[PDB]
């Protein structure tokens, strides 16, 4: 792979992301002004934990399906073996969802997009786990600080998935091949866009995985 070939990979990954992002960035930002009323918030808080779990579990399952679609469209993911493809997605899909979530988070008012409008963390009071929820809001808030480009998310979340340190892989060498090219793609693009400053500020990939191991 030469350097013009790396730009095809970058473009490819950015378009796979564009297709599989579920929520359009334009739409998310326009909806920010559309925020749940105190009456509506109370409505959600009045609900059973069980109903909130079903709604949340539904919406996030859908979210995972979109990540799987993304992965399927990455160059050479489908060329991996079946066991490896599952290991990578089992370990990485939820992590990608958590990173993608920062686009739906408005740091001005500490709110997140949920069922058509923006709500604070008190929306999910019924679930009875503010530990998990504030820490999801905190993580989203810190990624908000970076003002991630769409392409930066695409490239970064591709590297979240394609990680040859996941235990269970049968073809480590094959997955390193992709990881290494994707790393070059990411680093190259950050040079092209004078955004090398963000490498020092991305969260550690240990800490991405530890907030999902606790999740479960
Ligand atoms: C990852 O990027 C994102 C970010 C937000 C959402 C999605 N994906 C998926 C779709 N989605 C929707 O609301 C759907 C649009 C559909 C049709 C409609 O009505 O427009 C309804 C969002 C969502 O699920 N919000 C959500 C869920 C959730 F579980 C939590 C939080 C927030 C914050 C704390 C927790 C409890 C973790």
| Residues 150, 35: Cα–Cα separation, whole Å | 23
List, in sequence order, every residue forming a beta bridge with 118; answer none if it has no partner.
Answer: 35, 113
Q: Measured over all CA atoms, what is the biggest interatomic distance in the chain, rounded to whole angstroms?
A: 58
- Report the candidate in 57, 59, 53 with the shortest Cα–Cα distance to residue 126: 53
| Helical spans, DSSP H, in 23-104 | 25-31, 38-46, 49-72, 82-100
| CA–CA–CA angle 178, 184, 186 (5° rounding) | 100
Rg (CA), the chain: 18
| Cα 181 to ligand 1 centroid, rounded to whole Å | 32
How many Å apart are CA 23 and CA 96, to the nearest integer? 14
CA separation for the pair 31, 116 (Å, rounded): 8
Rounded Cα–Cα distance for residues 101 and 172 (Å): 29
Residue 117: phi and psi, rounded to 5, are -140, 180
- Give the DSSP letter of residue 129: -
How far is Cα 174 from Cα 199, in angstroms, rounded to an integer? Answer: 25
d(CA 183, CA 189): 10
How many other C-beta atoms are found inside a 10 Å radius of the C-beta of residue 6? 18
Name the one residue in this structure whose structure tokens are 């990954």. 13
CA 84–ligand 1 middle distance (angstroms): 28
Mutate to test the pocket of ligand 1, among 63, 67, 92 (most ligand atoms within 8 A of CB): 63
Q: Match 């979109």 to its residue by tokens.
A: 66
Of residues 73, 71, 62, the one with CA closest to residue 90: 71
Deposited experimental method: X-ray
Element (H, E) at 112: strand 111-114
The domains of the chain, with CATH numbers, are 1-216 (1.10.565.10)
Q: Report whether 185 contacts 162 (CB < 8 A).
A: no
The two three-digit tokens of residue 94, written as one number: 């939820």
Three-state DSSP class for residue 35 = strand
Resolution of the experimental model in angstroms, please?
3.0
Q: Are 166 and 88 in contact (CB under 8 A)?
A: yes
- Give the closest residue (by CA) to ligand 1 atom 26: 114
**Residue nearest atom 21 in ligand 1 by C-alpha distance:** 115
- How would you class 203 by CB atoms within 10 Å of its CB: exposed for 0-12, middle for 13-18, buried for 19 or more? middle
Instruction: Please give the order of strands across the beta sheet that includes 105-106.
Output: 105-106, 111-114, 117-119
208 C-beta neighbours (distance < 10 Å), count: 18
């Amino acid at each position: 792979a030469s350097l013009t070939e790396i730009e095809h990979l970058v473009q490819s990954v950015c378009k796979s992301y564009r297709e599989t992002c579920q929520l359009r960035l334009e739409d998310l930002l326009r909806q920010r002004s559309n925020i749940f009323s105190r009456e509506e918030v109370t409505g959600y808080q009045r609900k059973s934990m069980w109903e909130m779990w079903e709604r949340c579990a539904h919406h996030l399952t859908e979210a995972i399906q979109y990540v799987v679609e993304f992965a399927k469209r990455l160059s050479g993911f489908m060329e991996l073996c079946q066991n490896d493809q599952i290991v990578l997605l089992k370990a990485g899909a939820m992590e990608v969802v958590l990173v993608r979530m920062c686009r739906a988070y408005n740091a001005d008012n500490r709110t997140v997009f949920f069922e058509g409008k923006y709500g604070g963390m008190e929306l999910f009071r019924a679930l009875g786990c503010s530990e998990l929820i504030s820490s999801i809001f905190d993580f989203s808030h810190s990624l908000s600080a970076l003002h991630f480009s769409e392409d930066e998310i695409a490239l970064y979340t591709a590297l979240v998935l394609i990680n040859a340190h996941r235990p269970g892989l049968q073809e480590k060498r094959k997955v390193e091949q992709l990881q290494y090219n994707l790393e070059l793609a990411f680093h190259h693009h950050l040079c092209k866009t004078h955004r090398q400053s963000i490498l020092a500020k991305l969260p550690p990939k240990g800490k991405l995985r530890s907030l999902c191991s606790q999740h479960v």
